Design a protein around this ligand. Sequence first.
Ligand SMILES: N=C(N)NCCCC(=O)NC[C@@H]1CCCN1C(=O)[C@H](CO)NS(=O)(=O)c1ccc2ccccc2c1
Lengths: 9, 28, 258
Amino acid sequence: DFEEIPEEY
Amino acid sequence: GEADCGLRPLFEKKSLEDKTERELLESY
Amino acid sequence: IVEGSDAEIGMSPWQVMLFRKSPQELLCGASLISDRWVLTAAHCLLYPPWDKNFTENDLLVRIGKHSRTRYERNIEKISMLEKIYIHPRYNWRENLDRDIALMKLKKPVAFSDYIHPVCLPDRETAASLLQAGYKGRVTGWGNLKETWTANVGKGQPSVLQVVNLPIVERPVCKDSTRIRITDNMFCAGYKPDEGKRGDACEGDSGGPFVMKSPFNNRWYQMGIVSWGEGCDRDGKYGFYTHVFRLKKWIQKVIDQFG
Ligand SMILES: N=C(N)NCCCC(=O)NC[C@@H]1CCCN1C(=O)[C@H](CO)NS(=O)(=O)c1ccc2ccccc2c1
C-alpha cells in the first residue's frame, strides 16, 4: 500500500 | 521549537491564508 | 477524517506520522512540538486489549508529508525515536484517561517550508479559546468513513485530510456517552440540530486538534485525537485529550530528559 523507503532509514 | 512556533512558512509568514482559516476565526 | 477535505501544501507543518517498520504501515498521527519532541496519544503505543506495546526501535517518525502512501523524497524527513515517554496514570482499562505520550527523536529535525512546530497552550490562551462554540482543526491520514456496513469503495485518503470542528459544552459531551468522561478530555462535533457533518476516525489518533489565536496569529495545539464510538455518527461527539491540563506533565519530562 505504501511506497518503500530507503534501506538506511 | 518554542518562540517561533505556530507560524507556518507558507501562510502566516507570507501574510497568506488557507481555504478554511476564516471559518475558524469567525467562530470566535 | 470523515467529511473533511484535502490539506494544502504546508498547511499543517506540525503533522507527524507514526509509521511502523514491519509490517510497513501508518500507525497514527502526531505533532512536532519542538525540533526533537513529538506529541502523540498513549494508545498508539500502549494498548493491551489489542496486544500493542511498541518499543522505540519498532517504528519511525516521518515529517513533511502530504501524500499518505508516497515516499516524497526531498520533502519529507524520516527520524528515529530515541526514547518514548507515556503518561504514568494512563488508563486503557476503563476510559482512556490521560491518553498522552511524548516521543524523543535521536537527532533534532531540520525545519523547512513543510516542517515546523505547533505551540502549546497556556492558561490565558486556554481560558480564552477553549469555549463551547469555538471551532478547531483536525488533520490525519485516517479513515474516510466509519469502518462498517456495506461501505463499497476506497475509504482511505491519498493526501492529508482536514476538518474544522466546534467545541461542545461539557454537559452535552457527558450525556452522549455511557462512558465515564474526565476533565482530561473534551468533545467536539456538530450538535444534531446543526444537521452538518465531519469527524476524526480510526487512524487519526494522536493527531493534533488545533486552534488559531486571534491575539498572536499563532497556532496552538489544544487536543489530541483520543477516542469515540463510531465515526460521524448521529448524536455522538469525538473526544480529544485535554493538552493544557496535561501540560504540567509535558513540562516535567522534557525539561528533565532533554
Ligand atoms: N473520533 C471518532 N469517532 N473516533 C475516533 C476513534 C479514535 C480511535 O481510533 N480510538 C481507540 C480506542 C481504542 C481502540 C478502541 N478505541 C475506540 O475509540 C474505538 C475506536 O473505534 N471506539 S470504541 O467505541 O470502540 C471505544 C472503545 C473502547 C474504548 C475504551 C476506552 C475508551 C473509549 C473507548 C471507545
